[PDB]
A paper describes a structure:
Although other intermediate filament proteins have been demonstrated to form amyloids, KRT8 specifically has not previously been characterized as an amyloid-forming protein. This protein, like other alpha-keratin proteins, contains a central coiled-coil domain that is flanked by an amino-terminal head domain and a carboxy-terminal tail domain, which are both low complexity in sequence composition. KRT8 is known to aggregate pathologically, primarily in the form of MDBs in liver disease.
For experimental validation, we selected three of these KRT8 mutants ([name], Y54H, and G55A), all of which are found in people with cryptogenic liver disease, as well as three FUS mutants (G191S, G225V, and G230C). Segment crystal structures of KRT858–64 (wild type: SGMGGIT; [name]: [name]) for the wild-type protein and KRT8-[name] were determined.
Author numbering:
A (entry chain A), B (entry chain A), C (entry chain A), D (entry chain A), E (entry chain A), F (entry chain A), ...: 58 to 64
The structure:
Amino acid sequence: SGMGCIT
Amino acid sequence: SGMGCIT
Amino acid sequence: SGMGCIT
Amino acid sequence: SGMGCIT
Amino acid sequence: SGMGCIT
Amino acid sequence: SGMGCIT
Amino acid sequence: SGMGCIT
Amino acid sequence: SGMGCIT
Amino acid sequence: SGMGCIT
Amino acid sequence: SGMGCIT
């Protein structure tokens, strides 16, 4: 249950 | 249950 | 149940 | 149950 | 249950 | 369940 | 379940 | 469940 | 469950 | 569950 943002 | 955004 | 966006 | 967008 | 942002 | 973009 | 874009 | 962007 | 961006 | 950005 993971989320990643490289913005 | 993962989500990834490279913006 | 994954979603990926390379924007 | 996956979805991918390369925008 | 992790989330990462490289902004 | 992989996606790659060389932009 | 892979997708690749060389843009 | 990986995604890569070389921008 | 990895993502990489070389920007 | 790793993410890398070389900006």
